[PDB]
Design a protein around this nucleic acid. Structure first.
Ligand SMILES: [Mg+2]
Ligand SMILES: [Mg+2]
Ligand SMILES: [Mg+2]
Ligand SMILES: [Mg+2]
Ligand SMILES: [Mg+2]
Ligand SMILES: [Mg+2]
Ligand SMILES: [Mg+2]
Ligand SMILES: [Mg+2]
Ligand SMILES: [Mg+2]
Ligand SMILES: [Mg+2]
Ligand SMILES: [Mg+2]
Length: 1282
RNA sequence: AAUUUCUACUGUUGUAGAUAGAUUAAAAGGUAAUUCUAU
DNA sequence: ATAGTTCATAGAATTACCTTTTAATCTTAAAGGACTGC
DNA sequence: AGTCCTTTATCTAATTTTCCATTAGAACTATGC
C-alpha cells in the first residue's frame, strides 16, 4: 500500500508544451506566395526596434521627472532616524512607524509621477497610433528632438537616424495591442506596489538605505582617519561629478562644485534620484579614468583603502562605501574612459595588421630598427659597457616580477637592497638605528620609484656572498634575462608569417565570423601572438620612466639609452588598446538569431481559443485519426468557421475543437453584470449596488471608484452571490456551461463561489467536418493547416512516448473532460527556425556505424542518417500553454501536509539518502525504520537491463578540458548541458525508488553544512540535481501506469511544492529533507565512533603530556591486539569513553599490530602478559619512539583505506562491538554498508532517521525542528543500537 | 550520428529519461586589461 | 626516500566580454470606441 | 446589426533567515634516513 496514494491532484501548475508544425498540403505554397514568413521575420526585428525607441522615450521621461522630483528633507530625516533605530532592537510599533514614513515617501513620488502629463499616454494607443485630431506623444517627442537637431540613436547601429525611428513607429499603426505584454512590463517600471521592477522601489527601498549607510560611514570616517580622504585631490579630480545644479539642504539654485559634507547631507539625496546623479555619486565613490592621464583619478573607496593599508588597521575596511544601484531603464555611458569598439572581423584584421607593420617599419633618430635598437642595447648590456649608476629599474610590480622570474621569489631583490642600504648607511648599531637614520634609509629602499642597477648589483653581491653557494642568485642572471628579450621578435615573425592565411580567411568585411565556435583554433593563434607582444611590453616595462612627479631628485640616466628606449616603448605601448579592443570584440557570444514569432497578419493571433473570439484570434484546433492539427485562417477570410459554415460541411473527415471558457470570474462577473451596455438587463437591486460600491462582499477587495472599503459582511456576501447566480441564469449563453452550484449558505467567502464558477466554466466539444471541405480550404489558401508533430506521433513510433506527448493527448481525452484536469490555456505562440547548418550525411547508408557496452557494436541501417537533421531545413514550431490540476487551488503549506502524512504512515516509511562520493559520482542507501539498509546501488551507471550506459567513464573525461584552457578567448562548451542530461537520467531512477519503496529523500544541505572536500560531482551540479528532483516531483507520472490509477496521466504524484530559490530550500521541500553532512563519512556505523583525536607529533615533552592523560593502554592478552582507553573530556572537547583497538590492516598494507609489537620489542617496555604500558611509555625520552608511536596511532584511526588502485575503496572500524569483532566493509552484510562512500550515505540516512523520529512526535500545534546538532547526532548514532 | 528541445545513445526512419514558455528588469559572480597600494 | 610548498598573493578602482540567479507581467472573453451597414 | 481594434474587470490565503558548524603536475626546496 503506497503511502503517497492520496497525494494526488493537490495543487495546480502551469506548463508549456512544444511541438513541430508540419505544413499540410499546399499551405506552404500559399504562405510563401503571400510572403508571410519573410514579413514576420522583418516584423520581429522592427518590433525589437520599436521597443528600443519606446525605451529611449521612457529613459528621457524618467530622467526629466526624477530631476523634477523633490523629496522634503523632513520625510528623509524621519525615515533616517527610524531606519537607524531599527538596527538597535526590533519592535512591532517601531517597524510599523517605519513603514509609515516609507510609504509616505513612496506615495509622494507615485503621485508626482501620476500627475505628470507625459505619464498618462505611456500605455495607451496614444503612444504609438493616435486617434484623429491629436498626434502621438512618441512621434511628437521624436519630431521635436529631430527639429532640435539632437541625434538620439548614435549609440546603436540598428537604428540609422530619427527618420528610420519615425517610419518604424509608423509601421505598427493599427497594431497597438501587439505591445500589450510589453506595456505590462513597462507599467511595472512605475508601480505603486512593492515590486522590485519600479523606480520608486529602486529609490526608496534600495538606494536610500545605501546612501544612509554611506552617510553614516562618512560621518564615522571624519572622526577616525580625518586626513585619509584627500579632499583637495578629489575636488581637483572629480569636478564634473561634484558639480550639481541645486543644493537641496539650502534649497539654493547654484551650479557650484559640492563638498563631501554637502554631498552627504541627507536633504541632498534628491540629486541621486536621477540616473545621472547616480553615476555622479558612484563616480565620486570609485573615481574615473581620464583619456590622456596615465594614472586613474581616485575615488573615496580608494582613499579609504590606501589609508587602511598604510596604517595596517583592517578596522577601517568596514567604512567602504556601497555604490548606488542603477535606475530601472537607464542606458548611460560611463564617466570613465570607454574604448572604441569594433564592428566586424575586417576591423580586427586591419587594426592588427597596421600595428604589426608599424613595429617593423619604425626607426628612431638613428637608422636602427626597433628590434635592432633593442637587440643592440640589450647585447650592449650583456657586456659591461654601460654604467649601472645610470640605468634604473622601476621599484614596482615589474621589479618583483623580474625577481620572481629570475630567482623564483619576489622578495629577494627587495630584502637584498634593504640589507645593502642598512649595512652601508647607519652601520653603527645596525638593528635599531636613530630616527633620522631610518628616515634616510626609508627613502633608499621604499618610497623610491626607481633603483639604479649599480645599487642592485652591490646589494646582490653582498647578499650572495653572505648566503651559501647552493643558491646562485646572481646579477648575471638578470643581465641574461634582459639579453634574451631581443629573441622574441623571431617567434613573433614565425607566427606573423603563418598568420597570412588566417588573415585571408577574415580579411573580408563579412560580419562576425570569428565569434562562432568554428574559429576556435584560429582564435587561439591570434591571441597567442598578441600575448607575446604584450608580454614583451610587460618585460621591458620596467625601464620605462613613468613620467610622474619628480619634483626634485632627478635620476642621472643615460640620455641616449632612454631616448631610443622610450621611442620603442611608446611605439609598443599601442598594443594595450589594440589587445583590449580585439579581446572585447572576439569574446562575444556568436549569435542571437534562432527563431522569431509568427503572426500571420493577426496581432492577436492565438490569444484565446474560445469560439466567440475565433474570428479575432484565428486559431483553431482539429483532430483526425489520432493526429492533431492546428489551423490559422486568413485574416481577410475571417469567418471561415462561422456557425453557418459548420453544418454545411459536416462530415466524417476532421473533428473541430469547440473551446468555451469563462476566465477570471472575479473580474468577468462584475464586468458584465454592471457594464453600462448591460447593467439594465441584469437589473441590480439598489442593495446590491450598495454592497458592490462598498466592498462588503469581499474581505480585502477594492471598492468602487471614489467609494471606501467597509467591513466584510457575510449576509451581504451571500446576497451578492445570489445576485450572481440570478445574473448567470439571465446571461444569453453562459448557461451552456451547465453550472451546478453549491447551496448559497455553504459559501463562507465569495472566492469559493468564484472557484466553482472558474472550475465549471471551461468545456471542449467537437463538431464534425467533412475532409473535403478542409482539403478545399487548404488548397484554396484561405486556411493554413499544420500537423502538430513530434517523435511519438509518427507511425513508426512504438516506444514509450514523451511525457509532453501524454499531457497533450490527455488535454482532449474524455476521461479528462468529465472532471477536467488538463485545461488548454490562452496565449499560444508560433515560431519559425531558419536553416542553421547545411545538410551533410555524416554516416552513409549500409555502413557499420560509440557506447562501449552496446552488444551490437556495428549496427547497420538501411538508411543514411544526417547529423543535427533538425537544423538543416527551416521549420515551424508551436508553443502551447496548459494548466494542470485545473480545479485545484494551489500549493499552500505543503510541507505541513507532507509532515502530517508522514507522521500517520511512519511505520511504512523508508529513508532514501543520497550522497556524492570521492570514488562514486553518487551513491544511494535506503534504510528501514530500525536502521538496517534494505537496498543499495550506484548512480555511476544508468542503464536499462537491455543495454546499460556507464556515466562514470563518460564524466571522467570532461573535467580535464576546462582546467587546461579556462582562460582562452574562444571555447565551445557542451559541458553544462551534458551534466544536466546525466542528472535528468538520475532523477527518474530516484523517483522510481521513492514511489516503489515509500521513501523520503535525504540530501546534504548545500546552503549550510556542506562538505569542504573535493568530489567527482561538483557542488553546484549537485544543487542542480536537487532542484531538478524538486521540479520532477512537482508532477510525477509513470508512463507504464494506467490512465486512471495513481501515478498515471490523470492522477499524478505531487510530493514537492514549486521551487522558489536555492536559499529558500532550507531543510525541507516536500518529501525532500536537507541535513548537514558533518561527520557522515569518517564514522563507524555500528558504534558511531569518529576519529576526533587528531594526534600530531610535537616536542617530546608535549608527547609525554599527551600520553599522560590516557585512561589505559594495557595490551589485551586474549585476542592478540592492543587496547587504548580514554575520555574525550580530559583532552584539549567531546564526551564519552572508547576502546581503541589495533586489529586489521589499514593502508598508507601497514599492519599496526605488528608495527607496534616491533616498536615495543626494540625498546625497553615489555608487553608480555597484560602489562599496562600507559605508565611505561610516559617515562621514555627518545624522539623517534614517540614519533613512530603517534604514527602507528594515526594509522590505526584510518577507517578509510586509500588504495591508489581505483577498483575498490572500503572502510574498516577501530572499535569492536559487544560481540567483539570489528566491522569491515570488505566482509559486511546486506544490512550494513558495503564501502566508505556507502558509509557516508548511510549516516546521511541516519540523520534523516533522526528527522523521521522528530516528525513522528510532532504535535499538530507547534513548529517542527529540523536542525540536527552534532551533539544530538552523536548521541543518537552512539546509542542507537543499545 | 534522426529529437518540440536537451543529454546519452542506436536503443532501427527512431529508443530511454528529462523538458514552463513568451516578455521584461535587476543584482551577483567569472575572466581579461589598466591605475594604484600592502605584504 | 619521502613530505611540503609553490607556481608571488591580496585590498581598493575603472572598462569590456561572458554566465547565473531572482523577480516581475501574461498565459482572456467580452465590454467599449468607432465606423459602417441594413 | 457587423467589424476591427483596443481597453477592462479586479477574490483568496499564508509568508517575510534564524544560526545549525573540525586548475594540476611539477618543481624546488625541506626534512629525515
Ligand atoms: Mg531632482
Ligand atoms: Mg545610429
Ligand atoms: Mg502576445
Ligand atoms: Mg535595457
Ligand atoms: Mg614603492
Ligand atoms: Mg492585424
Ligand atoms: Mg485581431
Ligand atoms: Mg490578506
Ligand atoms: Mg520515446
Ligand atoms: Mg545551433
Ligand atoms: Mg546529440
Amino acid at each position: 500500500a503506497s503511502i503517497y496514494q492520496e497525494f494526488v491532484n493537490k495543487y495546480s501548475l502551469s506548463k508549456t508544451l512544444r511541438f513541430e508544425l508540419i505544413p499540410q498540403g499546399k499551405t506552404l505554397e500559399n504562405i510563401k506566395a503571400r510572403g508571410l514568413i519573410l514579413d514576420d521575420e522583418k516584423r520581429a526585428k522592427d518590433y525589437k526596434k520599436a521597443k528600443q525607441i519606446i525605451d529611449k522615450y521612457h529613459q528621457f521621461f524618467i530622467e526629466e521627472i526624477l530631476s523634477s522630483v523633490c523629496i522634503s528633507e523632513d520625510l528623509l530625516q524621519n525615515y533616517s532616524d527610524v531606519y537607524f533605530k531599527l538596527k538597535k532592537s526590533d519592535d512591532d510599533n517601531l517597524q510599523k512607524d517605519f513603514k509609515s514614513a516609507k510609504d509616505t515617501i513612496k506615495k509622494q513620488i507615485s503621485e508626482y509621477i501620476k500627475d505628470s502629463e507625459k505619464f498618462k499616454n505611456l500605455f495607451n494607443q496614444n503612444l504609438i497610433d493616435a486617434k484623429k485630431g491629436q498626434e502621438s506623444d512618441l512621434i511628437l517627442w521624436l519630431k521635436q528632438s529631430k527639429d532640435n537637431g539632437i541625434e538620439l540613436f548614435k549609440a546603436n547601429s540598428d537604428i540609422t537616424d530619427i527618420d528610420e525611428a519615425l517610419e518604424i513607429i509608423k509601421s505598427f499603426k493599427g497594431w497597438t495591442t501587439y505591445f500589450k505584454g510589453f506595456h505590462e512590463n513597462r507599467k511595472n517600471v512605475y508601480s505603486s506596489n512593492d515590486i522590485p521592477t519600479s523606480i520608486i522601489y529602486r529609490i526608496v527601498d534600495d538606494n536610500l538605505p545605501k546612501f544612509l549607510e554611506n552617510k553614516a560611514k562618512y560621518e564615522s570616517l571624519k572622526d577616525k582617519a580625518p586626513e585619509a580622504i584627500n579632499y583637495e585631490q578629489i575636488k581637483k579630480d572629480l569636478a564634473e561629478e561634484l558639480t550639481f545644479d541645486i543644493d537641496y539642504k539650502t534649497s539654493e539654485v547654484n551650479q557650484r562644485v559640492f563638498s563631501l559634507d554637502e554631498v552627504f547631507e541627507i536633504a541632498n539625496f534628491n540629486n541621486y534620484l536621477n540616473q545621472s546623479g547616480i553615476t555622479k555619486f558612484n563616480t565620486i565613490i570609485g573615481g574615473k579614468f581620464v583619456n590622456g592621464e596615465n594614472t586613474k583619478r581616485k575615488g573615496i573607496n580608494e582613499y579609504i583603502n590606501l589609508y587602511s593599508q598604510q596604517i595596517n588597521d583592517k578596522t577601517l575596511k568596514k567604512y567602504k562605501m556601497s555604490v548606488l544601484f542603477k535606475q530601472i531603464l537607464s542606458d548611460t555611458e560611463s564617466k570613465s574612459f570607454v574604448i572604441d569598439k569594433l564592428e566586424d572581423d575586417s576591423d580586427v584584421v586591419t587594426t592588427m595588421q597596421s600595428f604589426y607593420e608599424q613595429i617593423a617599419a619604425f626607426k628612431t633618430v638613428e637608422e636602427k630598427s626597433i628590434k635592432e635598437t633593442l637587440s643592440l642595447l640589450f647585447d650592449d648590456l650583456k657586456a659591461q659597457k654601460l654604467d649601472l649608476s645610470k640605468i634604473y629599474f622601476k621599484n614596482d610590480k615589474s621589479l618583483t616580477d623580474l625577481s620572481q622570474q629570475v630567482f623564483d621569489d619576489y622578495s629577494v631583490i627587495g630584502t637584498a637592497v634593504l640589507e645593502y642600504i642598512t649595512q652601508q648607511i647607519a652601520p653603527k648599531n645596525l638593528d635599531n638605528p636613530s630616527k633620522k637614520e631610518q628616515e634616510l634609509i626609508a627613502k633608499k629602499t621604499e618610497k623610491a620609484k626607481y633603483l639604479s642597477l649599480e645599487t642592485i648589483k652591490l646589494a646582490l653581491e653582498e647578499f650572495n656572498k653572505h648566503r651559501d653557494i647552493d643558491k646562485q642568485c646572481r646579477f648575471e642572471e638578470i643581465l641574461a634575462n634582459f639579453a634574451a628579450i631581443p629573441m622574441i621578435f623571431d617567434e613573433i615573425a614565425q607566427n606573423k608569417d603563418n598568420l597570412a592565411q588566417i588573415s585571408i580567411k577574415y580579411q573580408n568585411q563579412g560580419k562576425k565570423d570569428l565569434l562562432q565556435a568554428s574559429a576556435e583554433d584560429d582564435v587561439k593563434a591570434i591571441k597567442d601572438l598578441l600575448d607575446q607582444t604584450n608580454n614583451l611590453l610587460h618585460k621591458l616595462k620596467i625601464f620605462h620612466i613613468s613620467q610622474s612627479e619628480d619634483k626634485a631628485n632627478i635620476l642621472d640616466k643615460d640620455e641616449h639609452f632612454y631616448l631610443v628606449f622610450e621611442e620603442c616603448y611608446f611605439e609598443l605601448a599601442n598594443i594595450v588598446p589594440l589587445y583590449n579592443k580585439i579581446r572585447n570584440y572576439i569574446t562575444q557570444k556568436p549569435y542571437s538569431d534562432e527563431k522569431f514569432k509568427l503572426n500571420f497578419e493577426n496581432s492577436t493571433l492565438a490569444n484565446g481559443w474560445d469560439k466567440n473570439k475565433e474570428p479575432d484570434n484565428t486559431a483553431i484546433l482539429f483532430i483526425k485519426d489520432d493526429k492533431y492539427y492546428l489551423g490559422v485562417m486568413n485574416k481577410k477570410n475571417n469567418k471561415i468557421f462561422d456557425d453557418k459554415a459548420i453544418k454545411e460541411n459536416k462530415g466524417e473527415g476532421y473533428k473541430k475543437i469547440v473551446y468555451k471558457l469563462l476566465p477570471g470570474a472575479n473580474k468577468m462577473l462584475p464586468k458584465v453584470f454592471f457594464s453600462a451596455k448591460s447593467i439594465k438587463f441584469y437589473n441590480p437591486s439598489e442593495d446590491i449596488l450598495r454592497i458592490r460600491n462598498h466592498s462588503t462582499h469581499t474581505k480585502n477587495g477594492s471598492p468602487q471608484k471614489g467609494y471606501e472599503k467597509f467591513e466584510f459582511n457575510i449576509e451581504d456576501c451571500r446576497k451578492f452571490i445570489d445576485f450572481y447566480k440570478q445574473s448567470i441564469s439571465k446571461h444569453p449563453e453562459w448557461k451552456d456551461f451547465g453550472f451546478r452550484f453549491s447551496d448559497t449558505q455553504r459559501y463562507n467567502s465569495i472566492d469559493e463561489f468564484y472557484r466553482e464558477v472558474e472550475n465549471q466554466g471551461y468545456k471542449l466539444t467537437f463538431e464534425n467536418i467533412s475532409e473535403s471541405y478542409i482539403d478545399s480550404v487548404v488548397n484554396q489558401g484561405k486556411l493554413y493547416l499544420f500537423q502538430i508533430y513530434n517523435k511519438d506521433f509518427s507511425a513508426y513510433s512504438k516506444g514509450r512516448p514523451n511525457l509532453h506527448t501524454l499531457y497533450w493527448k490527455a488535454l482532449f481525452d474524455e476521461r479528462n473532460l468529465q472532471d477536467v484536469v488538463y485545461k488548454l490555456n490562452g496565449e499560444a505562440e508560433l515560431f519559425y527556425r531558419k536553416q542553421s547548418i547545411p545538410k551533410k550525411i555524416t554516416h552513409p547508408a549500409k555502413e557499420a556505424i560509440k557506447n562501449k557496452d552496446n552488444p551490437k557494436k556495428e549496427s547497420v541501417f538501411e538508411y543514411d542518417l544526417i547529423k543535427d537533421k533538425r537544423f538543416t531545413e527551416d521549420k515551424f514550431f508551436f508553443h502551447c500553454p496548459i494548466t494542470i490540476n485545473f480545479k485545484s487551488s494551489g500549493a499552500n503549506k505543503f510541507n505541513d501536509e507532507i509532515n502530517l502524512l508522514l507522521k500517520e504512515k511512519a511505520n511504512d516509511v523508508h529513508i532514501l539518502s543520497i550522497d556524492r562520493g570521492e570514488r562514486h559520482l553518487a551513491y544511494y542507501t535506503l534504510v528501514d525504520g530500525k536502521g538496517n539498509i534494505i537496498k543499495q546501488d550506484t548512480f555511476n551507471i544508468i542503464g536499462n537491463d537491455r543495454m546499460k550506459t556507464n556515466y562514470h567513464d563518460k564524466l571522467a573525461a570532461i573535467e580535464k578540458d576546462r582546467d587546461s584552457a579556462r582562460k582562452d578567448w574562444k571555447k565551445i562548451n557542451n559541458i553544462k548541458e551534458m551534466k544536466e542530461g546525466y542528472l535528468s537520467q538520475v532523477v527518474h531512477e530516484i523517483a522510481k525508488l521513492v514511489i516503489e519503496y515509500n521513501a523520503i529523500v535525504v540530501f546534504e544541505d548545500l546552503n549550510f553544512g556542506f562538505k569542504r572536500g573535493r568530489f567527482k560531482v561538483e557542488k553546484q551540479v549537485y544543487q542542480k540535481l536537487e532542484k531538478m528532483l524538486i521540479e520532477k516531483l512537482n508532477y510525477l507520472v509513470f508512463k507504464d501506469n494506467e490512465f486512471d490509477k495513481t501515478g498515471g496521466v490523470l492522477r499524478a504524484y505531487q510530493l514537492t511544492a514549486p521551487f522558489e530559490t536555492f536559499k529558500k530550500m532550507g531543510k525541507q521541500t516536500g518529501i525532500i529533507y536537507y541535513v548537514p553532512a558533518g561527520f557522515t563519512s569518517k564514522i563507524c556505523p555500528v558504534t558511531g565512533f569518529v576519529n576526533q583525536l587528531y594526534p600530531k607529533y610535537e616536542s617530546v615533552s608535549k608527547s609525554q603530556e599527551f600520553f599522560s592523560k590516557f585512561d589505559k593502554i594495557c595490551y589485551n592478552l586474549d585476542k592478540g591486539y592492543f587496547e587504548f582507553s580514554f575520555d574525550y573530556k580530559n583532552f584539549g572537547a567531546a564526551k564519552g569513553k572508547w576502546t581503541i583497538a589495533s586489529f586489521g590492516s589499514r593502508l598508507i598494507e601497514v599492519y599496526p599490530t605488528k608495527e607496534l609489537e616491533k616498536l615495543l620489542k626494540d625498546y625497553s617496555i615489555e608487553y608480555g602478559h597484560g602489562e599496562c604500558i600507559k605508565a611505561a611509555i610516559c617515562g621514555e625520552s627518545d624522539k623517534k619512539f614517540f614519533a613512530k608511536l603517534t604514527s602507528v596511532l594515526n594509522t590505526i584511526l584510518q577507517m578509510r583505506n586509500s588504495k591508489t588502485g581505483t577498483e575498490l575503496d572500503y572502510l574498516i572500524s577501530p572499535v569492536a562491538d559487544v560481540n567483539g569483532n570489528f566491522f569491515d566493509s570488505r566482509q559486511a552484510p546486506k544490512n550494513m554498508p558495503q564501502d566508505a562512500d556507502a558509509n557516508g550515505a548511510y549516516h546521511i540516512g541516519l540523520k534523516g532517521l533522526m528527522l523521521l523520529g522528530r516528525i513522528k512526535n510532532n504535535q499538530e500545534g507547534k513548529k517542527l525542528n529540523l536542525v540536527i546538532k552534532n551533539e544530538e547526532y552523536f548521541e543518537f548514532v552512539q546509542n542507537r543500537n543499545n
